[PDB]
Structure 1
Amino acid sequence: GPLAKIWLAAHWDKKLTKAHVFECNLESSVESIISPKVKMALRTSGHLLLGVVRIYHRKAKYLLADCNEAFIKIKMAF
């Protein structure tokens, strides 16, 4: 499912591309940790909780990079 991506984000996170970070929907990745089809050990719910927060971090990591170029590009011509 999508949990394979979150899983991969929690441990071997360097196998996620910018396009995967962007295309990934945090809202529905959460929706499938909270309502799992095979209810999971609390030990792996926390592994997932970390994988999500990695992506949320890395999303903000890119937005803030983009948001600065957007500022210096218009601060320049003006």
Structure 2
Amino acid sequence: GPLAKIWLAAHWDKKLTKAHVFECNLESSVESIISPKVKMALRTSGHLLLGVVRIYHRKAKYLLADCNEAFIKIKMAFR
């Protein structure tokens, strides 16, 4: 399922590749938690919440890396 990837990000996030992080639609992940097919325990929602935040943090990390490198590339091209 889709929430299975979020679970992995909560507990064992190393299984998630950069490609996994990039592809993850956090918006529909959140709708999957917010409106589940079957009501879920407070414990499970807490895990799923951290997983979503963890994938989100990794997107920011990769994007900051790529922005820094793009800025270095451009000013290097100036000289």
TM-score, normalised by the number of residues in structure 2? 0.97
The size of the alignment, in residue pairs, is 78
Unaligned runs of 5+ in 1: none
CA-to-aligned-CA distance 1:7-51 (integer Å, 9 cap, x gap): 000001100000000000000000100000111001110100000
For residues 76 and 18 of structure 1, the distance between their equivalents in structure 2, rounded to whole angstroms, comes to 27
Question: How far apart are residue 74 of structure 1 and its match?
Answer: 0.3
RMSD: 0.5
TM-score between both structures, scaled by the size of structure 1: 0.98
Aligned counterpart, 1:12: 12
Q: Post-superposition shift, 1:77?
A: 1.1
Which consecutive unaligned segments of at least 5 residues does structure 2 have? none
Partner-residue secondary structure (3-state), 2:39: coil
Following superposition, the deviation at residue 62 of structure 1 comes to 0.1
